[PDB]
Structures are given as C-alpha cells and as structure tokens.
Amino acid sequence: GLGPLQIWQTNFTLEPRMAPRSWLAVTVDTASSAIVVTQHGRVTSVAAQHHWATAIAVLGRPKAIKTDNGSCFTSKSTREWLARWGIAHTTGIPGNSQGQAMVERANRLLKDKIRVLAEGDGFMKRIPTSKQGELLAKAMYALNHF
Amino acid sequence: GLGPLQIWQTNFTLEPRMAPRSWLAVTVDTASSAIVVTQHGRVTSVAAQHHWATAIAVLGRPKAIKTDNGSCFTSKSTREWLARWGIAHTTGIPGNSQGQAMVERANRLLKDKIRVLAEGDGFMKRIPTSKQGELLAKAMYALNHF
Ligand SMILES: [Zn+2]
Ligand SMILES: [Zn+2]
Ligand SMILES: [Zn+2]
Ligand SMILES: [Zn+2]
C-alpha cells in the first residue's frame, strides 16, 4: 500500500528533426520517472488518446493524468476516452510547475538525447523518416533504463 | 545476481483481422513472461529489427534472443544489427519446444484476445485500420498487466 502514486504528466512538444511527424507526445510517470514518447503529425484529441493508449500498454493504467488546458486534452472526445478508462484528469495552466515542471524537464532531456544520437549518425538537421522510429525508441531506452 | 536470465523468444505470426499490416512480430521475455507485439506489413529483416528496437525500449536489452531459422532472423542484415547491440542469438527449427513453445502459446493467447476485444466492439471480420493500433495495445496490456 505505502508505495507511491500512479499519476502521469503529459504534454506535446515540437521537434523538427522528426518532421513530418514532429509533434512528440511525452508522458512522465511521476512515481517512477519513466518516460513514454510517441510521434504524431498533428496535435489533436485523437493524437492524445493514441499516445495514452501506448503509454498504458507500457506502464499500466494510472489513477490520474495531469495535463494543461490544451483543447486536445479538454475536448469532449478526450473527456469521454478518459472516462471510458476510469482515469481521473486534472488540468493546469501551461507549464504550471505543480503539474508540468517534470514533463518540461523531460522535454529537454529528450530533445537533447535526440540531438546527440542523431548527430552521431551524421544527421545534423532532419533525421531521415526511415530511421526516426528507431532513433526515438533508443532515446526512450537511454532515458529510462538510465 | 541469483535472479533470472534475460532471454527472449521472438516469432512472426499471421493475423488477418489486422490486415493490411497482418504480420505480428511477437516477443516473450522468458523470465517475466511479458509480451511485446508490433504490426508489420511484410516479414523482412527490417521488420524483425524495428520490432526488437521497440521491445528493447520497452523491456530493456536482453543477453540473448532465440528465434527459428527464418531468413529474416539469419540474414547478414540482422546478424549485424544484433552484433551492433551485443545481443547473442541462438536459432532453433520452427516451433522447437525448447525455444518456441512459449512464443507459440503467446501467439494463441494474443490472437484469442484480439478476437474477443474485436468482436466486442462489433468487428466480426477485419478490424478497421484506424482502430488496430489501439486494439493491439489493449490486448498487449491485458496480457501483461494480467
Ligand atoms: Zn495515431
Ligand atoms: Zn500545452
Ligand atoms: Zn517498421
Ligand atoms: Zn518462422
């Protein structure tokens, strides 16, 4: 019982080295500090739901998800998806230290790690589409399995 | 130290409810019995590598991977990818109880679970492309977080 609470913080951040699909949906499990990230072409309610569907398969179901006031997170579409899963949801103005400083620090570590790995294979600007998925999985791996 | 060994068994299995991308690459971690699955349009060396790239981000790096004698698993492409990662590889004739009974039992539980969930949303034959990914992530979730 007395071991910690399953609460996530999720946000989208922009990363042009991953273009065309340059919207990265990033989720930090505030307990374990495990990071889940996925690639998306557009930030929509459906992009938020598909991401969380992946994160649940990976981390398991959380009790609550903390996001900001973004529409993709407050639409009726998403409110219904979360309800369908029984996951509480609490908003917070963009970046609100309370619920966003972690996922924001995450954004940075992630983009840094994407740059290091990309430049190491000699990709200085955009990563070729066919290597994006493998490069993102490696970054995610490096950041979680420390 | 005296806690168990990180050895995987991987195989592809065919699932037409997931068409066009109906080749499911399935990996069982023989220690934890955790299951990783991904969708692929064609069974190729590159389909095996992309899958394992996902599984590593999810489960961490294994010491060895057991497959059968399939070409996608013995090509020079894959031998080099595995070497690049430092993961030993041991083959076994298709299905060889030794290294395949687990991933074969996995194949069945997975396809059963895909059928149950699909028919529950009223998809009796093929699952609509736009719901495949979410349905597969749920099946994977059900089978791992028991
Ligand atoms: Zn999507
Ligand atoms: Zn926002
Ligand atoms: Zn692929
Ligand atoms: Zn085979």
From Swiss-Prot, chains A, B:
CC cofactor: Mg(2+); Mn(2+)
Domain topic, free-text comment: The core domain contains the D-x(n)-D-x(35)-E motif, named for the phylogenetically conserved glutamic acid and aspartic acid residues and the invariant 35 amino acid spacing between the second and third acidic residues. Each acidic residue of the D,D(35)E motif is independently essential for the 3'-processing and strand transfer activities of purified integrase protein.
Function summary: Catalyzes viral DNA integration into the host chromosome, by performing a series of DNA cutting and joining reactions. This recombination event is an essential step in the viral replication cycle. Has a strong preference for using the 3'-OH at the viral DNA end as a nucleophile.
Species in which this protein is naturally found: Rous sarcoma virus subgroup C (strain Prague)
Binding site for Mg(2+) 3: N11, D68, E104
UniProt-recorded name of the protein: Integrase
Residue span(s) of domain Integrase catalytic: 1-146
Subunit structure: Homodimer; further associates as a homooctamer.
Free-text cofactor note: Binds 8 Mg(2+) ions per integrase homotetramer. Zn(2+) can also be a cofactor for the nicking activity, but not for the polynucleotidyltransferase activity.
Highest taxon of the lineage: Viruses
Covered residues, full protein: 1334 to 1479 of 1603
